[PDB]
Amino acid sequence: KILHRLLQ
Amino acid sequence: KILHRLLQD
Amino acid sequence: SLALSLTADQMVSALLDAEPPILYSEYPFSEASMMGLLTNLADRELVHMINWAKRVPGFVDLTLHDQVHLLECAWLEILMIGLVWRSMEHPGKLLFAPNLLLDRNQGKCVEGMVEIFDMLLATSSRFRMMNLQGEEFVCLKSIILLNSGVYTKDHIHRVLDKITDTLIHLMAKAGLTLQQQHQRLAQLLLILSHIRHMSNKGMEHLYSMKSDLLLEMLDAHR
Amino acid sequence: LALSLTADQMVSALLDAEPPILYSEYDFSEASMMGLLTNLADRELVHMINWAKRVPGFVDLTLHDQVHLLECAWLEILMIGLVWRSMEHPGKLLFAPNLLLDRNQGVEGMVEIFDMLLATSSRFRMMNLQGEEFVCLKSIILLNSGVYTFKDHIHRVLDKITDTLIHLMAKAGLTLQQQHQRLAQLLLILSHIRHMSNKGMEHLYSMKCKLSDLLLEMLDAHR
């Protein structure tokens, strides 16, 4: 998930 | 519209 | 409009007196049988909702076209908050009727209703944890009727301010502080955003699942 | 942290975390404007993710809960931002400082969503919505839209934002009755923003059946 990566 | 009829009775 | 001249207690008693009755369903399930019971129940509840709407202070003062638009927008929302209110004292179950008490596993009988069933249960537990009172429920339900289609107008917002004065007046009698009054007011109205979400997702399947009145109510969202 | 903030410190923290106003690559088809709107929303999602990190109480949530709240509210947050920028432009939606559209420039079925966004913008204009109140509503949308789709910590932050909104209305000279009415008026609009997002997400899935890797994963979250 790109959203999970950008949030990390 | 049936809603018109029920809103007047 | 005689609704603006009403006091807070007169507003509450007018809403409590206008409450529709708790209907029964037709005396295991399948996809077409459960949808048949729910459709038949919702179709009969629409007749009581329409007469309940006329008794909401300020609704009669609207034109016939504005009355139709508000009911067409919020009819599923009003059915849901009523179902959620009935299911408060039944954790983990939805009380569609006194003889129709369904749980999660019953929602799997039709493909796609489990998601709405879980959201309805979460809303019921949310009201249950808030100790939602009947006087607050009838205020929230009338707000849905007037607000859900107001932007699709000065009289409606004036009546909406009256229900807010009614809600705060109810919380002051319960002993809440000034800080607790606006916090609970904000908490209750934010749940209306989820009730709107549940209605939008539920309506989405309803005009794909396809009573002439229930069809005209359904086509109004296409 | 968030529970140990004053109302004034809550306002300054939200105002300081505001994302910038991005430009589009404008200057026209129905699919050329959709390319501009999709390209703009895609670049705005990058700033929104970093804006959500700076919302008080959001970092305290788990990574799975942060992903969930943004997946459910991303279109709501974009819409309330668009509506806020369009306040000073009646009858027009300011997607970007160089992209200002009215009814006619609105795609198959996007006209209904356009009118609802305009009606929401005029509603904010009639209320004379303040930027201090706007940043509170936008952060309320982020925390509330997915709170029941998973909680005590999130509701505690929501109560603090409500205290912040009431604190702002008391500074504006409003009486206690006027504070509660305006607070209710603002939160009922969030019910309409949820409605616009649901209808918009429905229209966005029909176009995928006819972007970028992030906007597709955001769309797939709503199935």
Amino acid present at D43: R
3-state per-residue secondary structure call for C67-134:
HHHHHHHHHHHHHHHHHHHHCCCCCCCEEEECCEEECHHHHCCCCCCHHHHHHHHHHHHHHHHHCCCH
Residues of chain B contacting C52 with CB distance shorter than 8 Å: none
3-state per-residue secondary structure call for C132-184:
CCHHHHHHHHHHHHHHCCCCCCHHHHHHHHHHHHHHHHHHHHCCCCHHHHHHH
Phi then psi for residue C100, to 5 deg, are -140, 80
Using alpha carbons only, give the angle C143, C137, D150 rounded to the nearest 5 degrees.
90
- The two three-digit tokens of residue D199, written as one number: 């209808």
Question: Which residues of C line the annotated binding site for 17beta-estradiol?
Answer: 45, 86, 205
Q: Are strands D99-101 and D93-96 parallel, antiparallel or unpaired?
A: antiparallel
Q: Determine whether the interchain pair D49/A1 forms a contact, defined as Cβ–Cβ distance below 8 Å.
A: no
Residues of chain C contacting B6 with CB distance shorter than 8 Å: 47, 50, 213
Q: Determine whether the interchain pair B7/C216 forms a contact, defined as Cβ–Cβ distance below 8 Å.
A: no
CATH classification (class only), C1-222: mainly alpha
The answer to whether A7 faces chain D, any CB pair under 8 Å, is yes
List of residues 6+ apart from C65 with CB closer than 8 A = none
- Please answer whether residues D66 and D52 qualify as being in contact, where contact means their C-beta atoms are separated by less than 8 angstroms: yes
Q: Which CATH number fits domain D1-223: 1.10.3720.10, 3.30.70.1140, 3.40.50.720, 1.10.565.10?
A: 1.10.565.10
- The two three-digit tokens of residue C148, written as one number: 């859900």
List of residues 6+ apart from B5 with CB closer than 8 A = none
- Burial track D85-95 (b if 16+ CB lie within 10 A, e otherwise): bbbeeeeebbb
- Cα(D73)–Cα(C171) distance, integer angstroms: 30
Nearest to C140 by CA among D191, D166, D132, D86: D191
Which one of D70, D75, D212 would you mutate to disrupt binding with A, by most A Cβ within 10 Å of its Cβ? D70
The answer to whether B2 faces chain C, any CB pair under 8 Å, is yes
In chain D, where the domains are located: 1-223
Q: Running DSSP on this structure, what letter comes out for residue D94? A: E
- Cα(D218)–Cα(C3) distance, integer angstroms: 45
- Cα(C108)–Cα(C168) distance, integer angstroms: 40
- Cα(C214)–Cα(C218) distance, integer angstroms: 6
> C178-209 and C134-147 are packed helices; what angle lies between their axes, rounded to 10 degrees?
60
Q: Determine whether the interchain pair C160/D184 forms a contact, defined as Cβ–Cβ distance below 8 Å.
A: yes
Resolution (A): 2.2
Torsion of Cα atoms, C36 then C38 then C39 then C45, to 10°: 140
Structural biology method used = X-ray
- Cα(C147)–Cα(C142) distance, integer angstroms: 9
- Cα(D37)–Cα(D35) distance, integer angstroms: 5
Report CA C220 to chain centroid distance, whole Å.
18
- Cα(D46)–Cα(D51) distance, integer angstroms: 9
Strands (E), D41-191: 93-96, 99-101
Task: Answer whether C touches B (≥3 Cβ pairs < 8 Å).
Answer: yes
Residues of chain B contacting C64 with CB distance shorter than 8 Å: 4, 7-8
- The two three-digit tokens of residue D174, written as one number: 């409003």
